[PDB]
Amino acid sequence: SHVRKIIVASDAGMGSSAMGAGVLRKKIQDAGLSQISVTNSAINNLPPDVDLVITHRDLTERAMRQVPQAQHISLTNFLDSGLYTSLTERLVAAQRH
């Protein structure tokens, strides 16, 4: 049971989800974590095997519901680089640890 799956979800999963996914994905690849996979999809579609779910706070309640047993991270803004940076550092820390 290793956390390696990160998926971003949204209302339609065809807008903000695309950018969130790309940035996170790039950082993960840069960190040499080829073992971690990144994809995006609509909220209505989230595999129960997902370890990490990243969505906008407005829809985090929904994702939690589908899988309240999963790990959810809430965002505030689409280009909130500060939050993205913090989250990335954290995941890296959790990866080693």
Binding site: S10, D11, A12, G13, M14, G15, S16, S17, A18, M19, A21, G22, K26, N40, A42, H56, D58, N77, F78, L79
Partner: protein, 144 residues
Amino acid sequence: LFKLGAENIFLGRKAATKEEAIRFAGEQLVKGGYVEPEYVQAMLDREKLTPTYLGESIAVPQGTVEAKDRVLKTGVVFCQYPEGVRFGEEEDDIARLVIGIAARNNEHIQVITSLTNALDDESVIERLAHTTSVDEVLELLAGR
């Protein structure tokens, strides 16, 4: 995955609202045979759910998953608004690049990913936002 040429690059546009910009992009997707008429409202429908602003002065409006069968072929319409069009949640979320997309099989994130990959540098967006050269646009997005 998508063809880009002079026929789908529109520079120096103006729009008071994001709805007008989206409608223009939608009209151009219809015009180039990328989508059927029902897709235009589907782009406006999608915009209501959550903005298609992606940060960094870029917006990528597209239709909902429900409109997938009204898409004839994957396509993009590059629309430049030098004066900007408010597109995101806040008044500060202004887009100067409004890229209307139509993707077969609801594959919009693949098209968005390809575009944003070519827009990974701040200097490229600035240049695209105010350039009066179509050829320059093609050059900067040709490696996509």
